[PDB]
Amino acid sequence: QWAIHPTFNLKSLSCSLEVSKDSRTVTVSHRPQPYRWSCERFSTSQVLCSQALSKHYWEVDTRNSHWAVGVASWEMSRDQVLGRTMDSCCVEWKGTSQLSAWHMVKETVLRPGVVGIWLNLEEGKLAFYSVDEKLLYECTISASSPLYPAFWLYGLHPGNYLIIKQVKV
Amino acid sequence: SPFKPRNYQLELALPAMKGKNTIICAPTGCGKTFVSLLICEHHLKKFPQGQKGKVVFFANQIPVYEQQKSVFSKYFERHGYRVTGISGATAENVPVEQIVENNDIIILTPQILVNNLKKGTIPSLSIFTLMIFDECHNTSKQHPYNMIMFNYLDQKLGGGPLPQVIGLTASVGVGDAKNTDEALDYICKLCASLDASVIATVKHNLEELEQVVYKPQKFFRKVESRISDKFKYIIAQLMRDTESLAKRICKDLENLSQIQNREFGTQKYEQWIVTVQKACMVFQMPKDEESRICKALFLYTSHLRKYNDALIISEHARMKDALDYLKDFFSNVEIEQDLTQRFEEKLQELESVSRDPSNENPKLEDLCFILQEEYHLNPETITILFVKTRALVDALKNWIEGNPKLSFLKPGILTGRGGMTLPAQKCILDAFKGDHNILIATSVADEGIDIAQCNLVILYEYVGNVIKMIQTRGRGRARGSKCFLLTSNAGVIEKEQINMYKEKMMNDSILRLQTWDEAVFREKILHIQTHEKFIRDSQEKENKKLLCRKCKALACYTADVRVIEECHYTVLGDAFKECFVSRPHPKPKKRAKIFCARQNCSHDWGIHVKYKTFEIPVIKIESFVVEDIATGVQTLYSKWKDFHFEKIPF
Numbered sequence: 075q076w077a078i079h080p081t082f083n084l085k086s087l088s089c090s091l092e093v094s095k096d097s098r099t100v101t102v103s104h105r106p107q108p109y110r111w112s113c114e115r116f117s118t119s120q121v122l123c124s125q126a127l128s129k130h131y132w133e134v135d136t137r138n139s140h141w142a143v144g145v146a147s148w149e150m151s152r153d154q155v156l157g158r159t160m161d162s163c164c165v166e167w168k169g170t171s172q173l174s175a176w177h178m179v180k181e182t183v184l185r186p187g188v189v190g191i192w193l194n195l196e197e198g199k200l201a202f203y204s205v206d207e208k209l210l211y212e213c214t215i216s217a218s219s220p221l222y223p224a225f226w227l228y229g230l231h232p233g234n235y236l237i238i239k240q241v242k243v
Numbered sequence: 244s245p246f247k248p249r250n251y252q253l254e255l256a257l258p259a260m261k262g263k264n265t266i267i268c269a270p271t272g273c274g275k276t277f278v279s280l281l282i283c284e285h286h287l288k289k290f291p292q293g294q295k296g297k298v299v300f301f302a303n304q305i306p307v308y309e310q311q312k313s314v315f316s317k318y319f320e321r322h323g324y325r326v327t328g329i330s331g332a333t334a335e336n337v338p339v340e341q342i343v344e345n346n347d348i349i350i351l352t353p354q355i356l357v358n359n360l361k362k363g364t365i366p367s368l369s370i371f372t373l374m375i376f377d378e379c380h381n382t383s384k385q386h387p388y389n390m391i392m393f394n395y396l397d398q399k400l401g402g403g404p405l406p407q408v409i410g411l412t413a414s415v416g417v418g419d420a421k422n423t424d425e426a427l428d429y430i431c432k433l434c435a436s437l438d439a440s441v442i443a444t445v446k447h448n449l450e451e452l453e454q455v456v457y458k459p460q461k462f463f464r465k466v467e468s469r470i471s472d473k474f475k476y477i478i479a480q481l482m483r484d485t486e487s488l489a490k491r492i493c494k495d496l497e498n499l500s501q502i503q504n505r506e507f508g509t510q511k512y513e514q515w516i517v518t519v520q521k522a523c524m525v526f527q528m529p530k531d532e533e534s535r536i537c538k539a540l541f542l543y544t545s546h547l548r549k550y551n552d553a554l555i556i557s558e559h560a561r562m563k564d565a566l567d568y569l570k571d572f573f574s575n576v577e578i579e580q581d582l583t584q585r586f587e588e589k590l591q592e593l594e595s596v597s598r599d600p601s602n603e604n605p606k607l608e609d610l611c612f613i614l615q616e617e618y619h620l621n622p623e624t625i626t627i628l629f630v631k632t633r634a635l636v637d638a639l640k641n642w643i644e645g646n647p648k649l650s651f652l653k654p655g656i657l658t659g660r661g662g663m664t665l666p667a668q669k670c671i672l673d674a675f676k677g678d679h680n681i682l683i684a685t686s687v688a689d690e691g692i693d694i695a696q697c698n699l700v701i702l703y704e705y706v707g708n709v710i711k712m713i714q715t716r717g718r719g720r721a722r723g724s725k726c727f728l729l730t731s732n733a734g735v736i737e738k739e740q741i742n743m744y745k746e747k748m749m750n751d752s753i754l755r756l757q758t759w760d761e762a763v764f765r766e767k768i769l770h771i772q773t774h775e776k777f778i779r780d781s782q783e784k785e786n787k788k789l790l791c792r793k794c795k796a797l798a799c800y801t802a803d804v805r806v807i808e809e810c811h812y813t814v815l816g817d818a819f820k821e822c823f824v825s826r827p828h829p830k831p832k833k834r835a836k837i838f839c840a841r842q843n844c845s846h847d848w849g850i851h852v853k854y855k856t857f858e859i860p861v862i863k864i865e866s867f868v869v870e871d872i873a874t875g876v877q878t879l880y881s882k883w884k885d886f887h888f889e890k891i892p893f
């Protein structure tokens with residue numbers, strides 16, 4: 075019930091990464107996509123969900139290479155790397171074939187899978203899940219500024235796409 | 244000691260162990276150096292008591308020389324054999340005639356051996372018994388390896404004992420074949436050039452090779468250019484203006500050079516400018532107006548060339564660098580006042596567009612992206628970046644150190660001597676074993692640097708023949724490595740693809756050659772050697788005036804020039820002591836430079852220097868035009884070898 079039906083935003087898209095017309099699919103293009111030059115542009119292969127979040131649940135699949143999914147504020151630096159700055163907290167499947175959760179400077183590492191995020195700002199709790207279901211690392215983080223899901227995709231493996239999966243109650 | 248010999252090393256060693264002159268062809272990283280170690284050890288230990296033999300090992304580039312010397316020294320210390328090396332580094336070197344005799348293993352750079360052989364201090368090659376040629380694919384038209392082999396073969400075919408020859412390679416090279424037949428011909432000619440009967444490639448223990456050696460993966464990155472470039476447009480407008488200015492004075496110069504449809508940022512334009520120069524400063528008139536026209540055209544063409552260089556650097560390097568170069572030229576250095584006004588007019592617009600980051604060079608943008616995403620994926624990795632020119636090495640060093648986004652990178656420069664020195668190269672190399680993470684290298688990083696950890700190779704518009712492709716790709720000794728060719732031209736990508744094929748076709752041709760029956764191979768090799776030796780043997784068998792290239796002032800005459808130490812040129816006489824003027828505080832200060840006497844002509848002729856006791860000025864032929872004392876003809880000499888005269892000592 076608490077789950078929302080999110081969608082990507084087309085203002086923070088990376089020139090290397092492409093989005094489908096339905097805006098339910100992201101993927102890595104073979105060639106760069108020329109786009110507007112702006113201070114918003116990441117200049118790096120991650121994107122943000124369109125919906126702002128100021129009791130919401132949304133889940134993505136990791137089927138089809140190297141990915142990071144988490145939460146980030148708007149006040150984050152555009153050129154900064156996802157998951158290592160103050161405003162961001164994420165889980166990434168690193169190149170050592172391991173899954174980890176990244177905090178301000180730290181990295182707690184622990185078999186990948188289809189993941190889900192459930193947040194409650196009133197209780198200020200963040201929970202990550204694996205559907206098989208299963209549980210991932212849970213934290214107690216509440217942000218003053220409203221947040222967005224932040225997704226980083228591997229930028230050099232063409233044919234690697236990410237879809238947020240829309241389950242129903 | 245801890246190194247355990249693997250099977251394929253013994254397989255490769257076998258034919259050399261038997262005692263035939265052989266070539267070894269193995270993929271990069273398999274450890275051919277250890278194979279050389281084993282062959283040398285077995286060959287040296289074979290001799291009976293009271294008799295001993297020598298071993299010689301070459302290398303082209305200095306860092307490779309240093310690392311091979313270190314490897315040999317560490318391995319052969321325990322047996323007690325004495326090793327040593329010679330290079331350009333050793334100063335006041337003990338005469339080699341016996342440093343060859345004193346030691347067992349000697350490491351060199353082939354130019355030293357060629358020098359000694361030509362001078363004759365070393366009598367003959369028979370003093371040695373085993374010659375090892377690393378990176379043996381370079382034995383070709385005039386490379387020093389081939390001259391050593393020329394001495395070897397000229398000795399053998401005519402009438403003492405001769406040493407065994409071993410060569411190592413990772414790619415024998417395909418030359419310019421268009422079909423398997425020509426590749427086979429090229430490989431046969433190569434084998435003939437160094438007198439080898441056997442080519443050794445690992446086949447029995449192949450499967451062992453696949454999990455021992457990881458093949459690096461290849462990728463391409465095409466980057467488009469910007470449709471609208473403010474700096475390009477404004478500099479092109481300056482080009483059009485300066486071209487109109489130059490056109491107006493001269494009666495004609497469209498017709499002087501056959502070149503047509505000259506673009507602005509192309510090397511063809513640079514060749515056109517050079518041709519116009521070399522055709523105009525040689526043009527004669529029946530007199531001061533002649534000098535004035537020469538000066539005007541000289542200045543116009545010089546600024547044209549400098550701006551064209553700025554354009555090409557701008558399209559290659561970052562925005563700021565081109566303006567830096569142009570401003571330095573203008574500040575360091577009538578009509579020139581006019582051109583200075585023209586440039587200072589636009590200076591501020593140029594700076595404004597330079598400091599607008601939206602118009603950044605896209606190649607640098609994509610390179611930042613590649614480094615960022617890789618270092619995000621793997622926090623720790625060692626990467627190498629390949630460029631064409633040292634100026635770009637400095638530019639990339641500064642640009643990498645000045646980007647807040649790339650705080651990860653810790654840079655390390657590497658280039659050939661002359662300029663980094665030998666111990667500096669050794670320290671930079673050893674550091675990578677440490678706090679450095681990226682290495683910016685010129686062409687010297689080919690033919691084996693052997694960094695135990697490298698997972699990323701980047702080519703910045705760097706392409707060539709198949710040998711360079713293979714040797715560049717092979718650097719990624721670490722498993723999971725990758726190579727990325729970054730370019731803004733499709734033809735480069737096409738050349739890379741066709742080179743990959745050429746590698747495949749060569750690799751098939753060598754396997755075809757391996758099937759041939761023995762003693763027919765050797766027969767055709769002997770035939771080729773005989774024919775080539777015959778071909779080479781029969782192949783071979785005043786007081787003029789010099790004047791300033793910019794103001795046509797009578798500089799001197801060749802009857803007053805005396806060469807010192809056969810290698811410096813100077814002139815004595817008070818007449819020359821008036822024709823020039825030094826500068827009070829010379830730009831290096833590190834010694835006073837020479838300049839044209841007339842304030843109209845500020846042209847640098849030469850430089851002061853002191854022989855053992857005497858301070859004298861020396862000039863460069865690059866400063867004058869030569870004119871006959873009898874006729875009015877002129878030519879231009881770019882290099883003293885072409886000039887012919889009565890060379891007289893001090």
Ligand SMILES: Nc1ncnc2c1ncn2[C@@H]1O[C@H](COP(=O)(O)OP(=O)(O)O)[C@@H](O)[C@H]1O
Nearest residue numbers: 246247248270271272273274275276277691693
């Ligand atoms: N017995 C061994 N076990 C493991 N590594 C070895 C062994 N012998 C040599 N090597 C490795 O081989 C490398 C030398 O390879 P090299 O012959 O220079 O490559 P290439 O064939 O491209 O010239 C060294 O870095 C060394 O670590």
Ligand code: ALF
Nearest residue numbers: 271272413690691
């Ligand atoms: F001989 Al190599 F890398 F090809 F050392």
Ligand SMILES: [Mg+2]
Nearest residue numbers: 275276690691
């Ligand atoms: Mg080698």
Ligand SMILES: [Zn+2]
Nearest residue numbers: 791794839844
């Ligand atoms: Zn002059």
